[PDB]
Amino acid sequence: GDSWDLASSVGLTATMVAAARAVAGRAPGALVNDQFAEPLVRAVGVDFFVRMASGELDPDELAEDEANGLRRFADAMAIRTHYFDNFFLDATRAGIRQAVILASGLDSRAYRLRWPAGTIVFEVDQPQVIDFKTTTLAGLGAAPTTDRRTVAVDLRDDWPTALQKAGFDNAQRTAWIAEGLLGYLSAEAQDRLLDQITAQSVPGSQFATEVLRDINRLNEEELRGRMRRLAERFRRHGLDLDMSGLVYFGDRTDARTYLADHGWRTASASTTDLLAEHGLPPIDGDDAPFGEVIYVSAELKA
Ligand SMILES: [Mg+2]
Numbered sequence: 001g002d003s004w005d006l007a008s009s010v011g012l013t014a015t016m017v018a019a020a021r022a023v024a025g026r027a028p029g030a031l032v033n034d035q036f037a038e039p040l041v042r043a044v045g046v047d048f049f050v051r052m053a054s055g056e057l058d059p060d061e062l063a064e065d066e067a068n069g070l071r072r073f074a075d076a077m078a079i080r081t082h083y084f085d086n087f088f089l090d091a092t093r094a095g096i097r098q099a100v101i102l103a104s105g106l107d108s109r110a111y112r113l114r115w116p117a118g119t120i121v122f123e124v125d126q127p128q129v130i131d132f133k134t135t136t137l138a139g140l141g142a143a144p145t146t147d148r149r150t151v152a153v154d155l156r157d158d159w160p161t162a163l164q165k166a167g168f169d170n171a172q173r174t175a176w177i178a179e180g181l182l183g184y185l186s187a188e189a190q191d192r193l194l195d196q197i198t199a200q201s202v203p204g205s206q207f208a209t210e211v212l213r214d215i216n217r218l219n220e221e222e223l224r225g226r227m228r229r230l231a232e233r234f235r236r237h238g239l240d241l242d243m244s245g246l247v248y249f250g251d252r253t254d255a256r257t258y259l260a261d262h263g264w265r266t267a268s269a270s271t272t273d274l275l276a277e278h279g280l281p282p283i284d285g286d287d288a289p290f291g292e293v294i295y296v297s298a299e300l301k302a
C-alpha cells in the first residue's frame with residue numbers, strides 16, 4: 001500500500017531469478033546469457049538484486065556458504081533458462097507459430113530468441129508487471145523479435161477470455177510455458193491452470209513446466225531448514241525473503257499424472273541429469289532449498 005509505481009508490483013522472486021540469470025550469463029562457457037536480465041533488475045530498483053545482477057556483489061568476497069549458494073543458484077538458472085529457451089526453439093522448428101508465456105514476469109524471450117516470421121507470442125501476467133516490462137524494454141530501445149501481445153490478467157482471473165480477445169487462435173498448435181510457477185500454486189490452482197491450458201490446446205500443442213517433486217510433508221522440516229538458513233543469508237544483505245511461506249507442502253496430483261489423464265505425453269528431465277549433461281556441479285542437500293526440480297515437456301495427443 002505504501003508504493004504505487006510499476007516496479008513495486010514486481011515480485012521479489014521474479015527479481016531474484018532474473019538477477020541469477022544475469023550472474024549466470026557472465027560465466028565463461030555460459031549455456032545462455034539473458035542480456036535483458038541485468039537492465040530489468042536495475043529498473044526494478046531493489047538494491048540487493050541490482051548489486052547481485054551487476055556483479056557489484058562479488059561471490060569471491062562473500063562467505064563460503066553465500067558464495068556457493070549464489071553460484072549453485074546461477075547454475076540452476078542456467079539449466080532452467082536453457083531448458084525453456086530450447087523448448088520454444090524446438091516447438092517453432094516443428095512448425096508451431098503460437099506461443100504463450102504464463103506469468104511472464106521478467107522473461108525476455110520475446111526480445112532475445114529467434115522466432116520465425118508469423119509467430120505470435122502471447123504473455124500473460126498481472127497488469128502492473130506486464131506494463132513494467134513492456135515500458136522498461138521500450139525505453140532501453142530493445143524491440144521485440146516477434147509479434148508480441150500482452151494479456152494483462154492475473155492467472156487467478158479469466159485470462160483465457162482475455163487471451164482470445166488478444167487474437168489467440170485455439171484451432172492451431174500452441175507452445176505454452178509455466179516457468180517458476182507450479183510450486184507456488186495450491187493443488188486446486190495447479191489443476192485449474194492445467195485444465196485451462198488443455199481446453200485451449202489442439203493435438204500437437206506442447207507445454208513445458210517444472211515438478212518440485214520433493215516439496216511434500218515427508219521433506220517439509222528439512223526443506224524449511226534450508227529455507228530458514230537461506231533467509232538468514234538474505235537478511236545479512238538487507239533482503240527479507242522467507243521462501244517457506246510461498247510453497248505448498250500439501251498433497252496434490254503430480255502434474256505429470258494430471259497431464260497424462262488429459263491426453264498429454266510427458267518427458268521428465270531432472271536437474272541432476274541436466275547438470276551432469278552440461279558439466280556443472282551437482283545441486284543437492286543444502287544447496288537445493290526446493291529439493292530436486294524436474295523439468296517437464298508435454299505434447300497433447302490426438
Ligand atoms: Mg554448505
Ligand SMILES: [Mg+2]
Pocket residue numbers: 252
Ligand atoms: Mg498421491
